Design a protein around this ligand. Sequence first.
Ligand SMILES: C[C@@H](O)[C@H](NC(=O)c1ccc(C#CC#Cc2cccc(N)c2)cc1)C(=O)N=O
Ligand SMILES: C#Cc1ccc(C(=O)N[C@H](C(=O)N=O)[C@@H](C)O)cc1
Ligand SMILES: [Zn+2]
Length: 300
Amino acid sequence: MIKQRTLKRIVQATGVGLHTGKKVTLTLRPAPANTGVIYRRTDLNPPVDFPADAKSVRDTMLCTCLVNEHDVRISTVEHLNAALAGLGIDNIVIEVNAPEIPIMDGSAAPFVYLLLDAGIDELNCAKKFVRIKETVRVEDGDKWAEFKPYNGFSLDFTIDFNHPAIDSSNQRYAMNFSADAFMRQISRARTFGFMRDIEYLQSRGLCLGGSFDCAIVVDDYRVLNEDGLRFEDEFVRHKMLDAIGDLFMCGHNIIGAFTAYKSGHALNNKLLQAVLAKQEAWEYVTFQDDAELPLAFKAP
Ligand SMILES: C[C@@H](O)[C@H](NC(=O)c1ccc(C#CC#Cc2cccc(N)c2)cc1)C(=O)N=O
Ligand SMILES: C#Cc1ccc(C(=O)N[C@H](C(=O)N=O)[C@@H](C)O)cc1
Ligand SMILES: [Zn+2]
């Protein structure tokens, strides 16, 4: 039987928050079966829990955040969340002594190593997948994203970049998901932003943790980062990192074909909720026989 997984040990890392510019201590914890992914703030007293849920997502100007009953928020969860999907973590408690998850280097890669340190612990309970049964499409103007039936997990991302530092050769990335593919092709792709916008926010006391160390930054004409890009198509690669993170907000690996045109947090999540809302459009599945497991979701 393909089992749910959690961490073997508690681990912790430190980093700067994109918003506050302050040191944030991150602590990952093992958790029992079926409890799923939980983000927790410990700066507040008492601590607040934010169960990872498609409904609780809000796409803020900077990255994304989760919201509770009272509109208290925990921010910048999506990159770490993507790494959770990547390494196949089902149950876990994620604590920060601050309003946000550290931004680190702008990618998911630093989280990969952190999770590796924590190790994997298989729990004696079946792991549930969300198998796409019907085609489901959502749009926003000329933008669209859809899930289609397919025995595996694939993503086909196209984003409209009109920037001089992003070539037409590098607007599209497509992959068949797998822990290995995620760690090597996707995890190191950093987030990006426009330099004047960031200057402005920082002049207004926002985005204070922003630096070359946490994001690709471009002016009107070129990438400003001394060392350039980790990939020629690092931008679209990070957008797929973000898509994986968005989709995993439901706490389950999805079996199907993801396709998106100019999609983003808002639209990815809109698809996710649309799919989950239509009862006939999907179903839970478990694998007693380990060999039935689709290629995409085998251990790393
Ligand atoms: C792209 C988008 O979807 C999203 N990214 C963000 O919202 C975002 C926005 C800004 C920054 C940044 C910065 C900086 C700086 C800097 C450099 C040099 C000197 C100084 N003073 C400052 C990083 C991420 C995302 O990844 N969501 O998952
Ligand atoms: C707060 C805030 C804030 C949010 C978004 C913008 C923005 O759209 N900037 C424009 C731009 O094209 N950026 O790439 C143009 C204006 O540069 C500016 C400020
Ligand atoms: Zn991102």
